[PDB]
Ligand binder design. Structure first.
Ligand SMILES: NS(=O)(=O)c1ccc(-c2cc3ccccc3[nH]2)cc1
Ligand SMILES: [Zn+2]
Length: 258
């Protein structure tokens, strides 16, 4: 009886196994765009993904992860609110059963169809398991998805999904360039928060881009063909794998842009 996104094991239940679910810096949050303050001291973000090495795509039972080689500084995030160098380890998405829901962060209470998380860890902590025990251990770049025109750089991800339909399946996934997932602008909001799934550790500097990327209806429909279950188990479609907004508590959301 482990955590998930159903009636009986979804977000409102997680606190019983993970009491930090009710902590002081949980994610996601609603981004009130009128209350976020421009911070002219924030630097532009530096996204350096030209040397990225994707390796594998995995259905882990709660999303799919595209994993990278993070044994060297190859694809890194720096600048912005960050001190130091954060290495890309994986990306994944959260999405809905309908186009009107799916994102974890919201903007003035608006839900997007999906949200991409590019997860990076602070190299001063040596590896990822150590980083998630630190308050500045991770930087997750969040990018909203709206349904409209297709995103050509997403199609290679969409097309491999039928090979990882069920929990615990993985497939080779080399030479994927995550630059094709980014919007044109790197304007962002940033705040200190947490992992959005158990163990819900309070180790993340969140950087959420203001500009969404567009994806087609057909692209998101393929996300919704994935399964939460393992092979040979009753089919339960992987949809609505998002945690709702949590209380902001004693935090301020900063904007990189006026
Ligand atoms: N949705 S999210 O990007 O906040 C996210 C990123 C990473 C994890 C994440 C899960 C986990 C489990 C054991 C050890 C380290 C871990 N990092 C969870 C959520
Ligand atoms: Zn996520």
């Amino acid at each position: 009886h482990h955590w998930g996104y159903g009636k009986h094991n979804g977000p409102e239940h997680w606190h019983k196994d993970f009491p930090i679910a009710k902590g002081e810096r949980q994610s996601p949050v609603d981004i009130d765009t009128h209350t976020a303050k421009y911070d002219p001291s924030l630097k532009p973000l530096s996204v350096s993904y030209d040397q990225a090495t994707s390796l594998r795509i995995l259905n882990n039972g709660h999303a799919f992860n595209v994993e990278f080689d993070d044994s060297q500084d190859k694809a890194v995030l720096k600048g912005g609110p960050l001190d130091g160098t954060y290495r890309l380890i994986q990306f994944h998405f959260h999405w809905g059963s309908l186009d009107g829901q799916g994102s974890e962060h919201t903007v003035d209470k608006k839900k997007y169809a999906a949200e991409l998380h590019l997860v990076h860890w602070n190299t001063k902590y040596g590896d990822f398991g150590k980083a998630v025990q630190q308050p500045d251990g991770l930087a997750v770049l969040g990018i909203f998805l709206k349904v409209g025109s297709a995103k050509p750089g997403l199609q290679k991800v969409v097309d491999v999904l039928d090979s990882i339909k069920t929990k615990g399946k993985s497939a080779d996934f080399t030479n994927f360039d995550p630059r094709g997932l980014l919007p044109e602008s790197l304007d962002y909001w940033t705040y200190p928060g947490s992992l959005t799934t158990p163990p819900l550790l309070e180790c993340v500097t969140w950087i959420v881009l203001k500009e969404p990327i567009s994806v087609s209806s057909e692209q998101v429909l393929k996300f919704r063909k994935l399964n939460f279950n393992g092979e040979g188990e009753p089919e339960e479609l992987m949809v609505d794998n998002w945690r709702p907004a949590q209380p902001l508590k004693n935090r301020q959301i900063k904007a990189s842009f006026k």
